[PDB]
Amino acid sequence: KIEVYAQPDCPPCVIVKEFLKHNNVAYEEFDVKKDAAARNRLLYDYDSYSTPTVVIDGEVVAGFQIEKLQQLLN
Amino acid sequence: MKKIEVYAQPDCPPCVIVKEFLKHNNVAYEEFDVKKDAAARNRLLYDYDSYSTPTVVIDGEVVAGFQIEKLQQLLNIE
């Protein structure tokens, strides 16, 4: 239900994950570097060019925006 | 006071998030551990009127707790 799209050497990705963990959010994570299917979903399903991208109930939070995770997750 | 002060402690994920945010933005801050540094703890509580970490002081202005957008604004970094 919550999906995190991340890639190597991505400091904002690590930060977003720590925020989700601290909030005990139940997410699944994908690597758009290793995983071409995840990459295609990032571009074609979510119309996003960058990581981190977080999808919450199909709402797309693209790039490094810690305050919106707070908005949409509670 | 240093221009940018970060008050933190161990086992404080919001503190880690704030410090990493500041690092990613290449902010020139000084940090203090209020568990290990009793003087820093006293400044947090008695000078800055804040009861928890993270607390960031930016040119004298106290930002208590996890306030990323307010940090961004005060640091003139966005």
Author numbering:
A (entry chain A): 3 to 76
B (entry chain B): 1 to 78
The study reports:
Thioredoxin (Trx) and glutaredoxin (Grx) are small ubiquitous proteins acting as cysteine disulfide oxidoreductases in the cell and belong to the thioredoxin superfamily. The thioredoxin BC3987 found in B. cereus ATCC 14579 is conserved among all the members of the B. cereus group, including B. anthracis, B. mycoides, B. pseudomycoides, B. thuringiensis and B. weihenstephanensis. Like E. coli and C. ammoniagenes NrdH the BC3987 have a α/β/α Trx fold typical for all members of the Thioredoxin superfamily. The BC3987 protein has a C-P-P-C active site motif that differs from what is typically observed for Trxs and Grxs.
Substituting the conserved Thr8 that is close to the active site with Ala has altered the hydrogen bond network and the effect of this has been characterized. The BC3987 wild type and T8A mutant structures were refined to 1.4 and 1.18 Å, respectively. In the T8A mutant structure, all residues 1–78 are visible in the electron density map of the corresponding high quality chain. In the other chain, residues 3–76 are observed, with lacking density at the side chain atoms of Asn76. The crystal structure of the T8A mutant resembles the wild type structure and the C-P-P-C motifs in these structures superimpose with a RMSD value of 0.053. One possible explanation for this observation is that both cysteines in the reduced C-P-P-C active site have lowered pKa values. The pH-titration curves for wild type and T8A BC3987 in Figure 1 are similar in the pH interval 6.5–9, indicating that the nucleophilic Cys12 pKa value is not affected by the T8A mutation. Following the reasoning above, the wild type BC3987 has two titratable thiolates with pKa values 5.1 and 7.2 while the T8A mutant has one thiolate with a pKa value of 7.2 and a second thiolate that behave different from the wild type. The control reaction with insulin and DTT is very slow compared to the wild type and T8A mutant BC3987 catalyzed reactions. The efficiency of thioredoxin insulin reduction is measured in this assay, and from the curves in Figure 2 it can be concluded that the wild type BC3987 has a different reactivity towards the substrate compared to the T8A mutant. The lag-time before any precipitated insulin is observed is much longer for the T8A mutant, and the slope of the curve after the lag-period is slightly steeper for the wild type enzyme. Disturbing the hydrogen bonding networks by removing a highly conserved Thr residue near the buried Cys resulted in decreased efficiency for the BC3987 thioredoxin.
